[PDB]
Amino acid sequence: CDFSEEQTAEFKEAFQLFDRTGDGKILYSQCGDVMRALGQNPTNAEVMKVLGNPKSDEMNLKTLNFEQFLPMMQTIAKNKDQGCFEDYVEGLRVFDKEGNGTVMGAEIRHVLVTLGEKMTEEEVEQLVAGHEDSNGCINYEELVRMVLSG
Template sequence: MRWGIGAPKKTRVPPKTFSFSIPLSLCPNTPGPHGMWLPTKPNILIVLPPDYKEAFGLFDRVGDSKIAYEQVADMMRALGQNPTNKDVAKILGNPSAEEMSSKRLDFEGFLPMLQTVVNDPQKGTYDDYVEGLRVFDKEGNGTVMGAELRIVLSTLGEKMKEAEIDALMTGQEDENGCVNYEGVKRPAGGEPGSPGQEGEEGEERQNGGEERKSERREVE
């Protein structure tokens, strides 16, 4: 139990996050008052924040406490996951285009699907993305042309829509239309190899890009 500090009387303050895991033997069999239990690994549960269900409700455009199949991927991304549309279609049973727009899913049915995505070990790290972008770094200076990146995102692999690309690229291009992919800041608390931490590692990446650029010039 947590208590407010400096309060005139003892007041329970709900934890800010429920993203920790605890042994299954210590968990109740029903959802708690502040969140829902989501099994992730054998004998381990994760407690979902109560706002997960609220977020689910924001995707409900009909008012029946359900979302359309075609919204499931976006719902998972809104909750911090990054599944591909192909992954989600497989989890949903490979429905047809008509079923994607007509079939609906409630929150209780959505949770096991979210669990499947959370348990998926095939997740790209920050370094994976950097290495992928380095293929398009023709100058070896840690940047890629924004226009070229837009073409790649819209034509290769799981194609992104123009609006999605615009949202992704906003604020990323410099005055020359280049994206400094090696200088991307890692979010606070980001684990090694994931988007996020600033510091010596970011400086090393930038310095490494400058060194490669100098080496190329010397060779020329």
């Protein structure tokens, strides 16, 4: 394990902060978003690639002790390093149909809802810093920095 005693202690203290129903554990459906909130950002698929069960009775029923959660978090902490600022800026540069930073909200909504795993009509509203009127014009450069800091 790569984590120090202080880091493991910090993870325990963080694990204790969640308003769980006294399970003393963490649900397999929830643990992905816990790991996201507390540190590195895995994909929806990665939560299975860490050798968590890809099929089950229910992901809300499946649940893990800290002893099982810690290595699951450690492996992505070590092996799931996210892209560079240059990489995300390049991605958005290739995406941007206006080729000037000022992307259209409808196109952003398309590449989050339609492509990949479907991001919800509640998520997108909390992600988009601007608004989607008849213009829909928003600058991606702010958004890339926002998610880089996330």
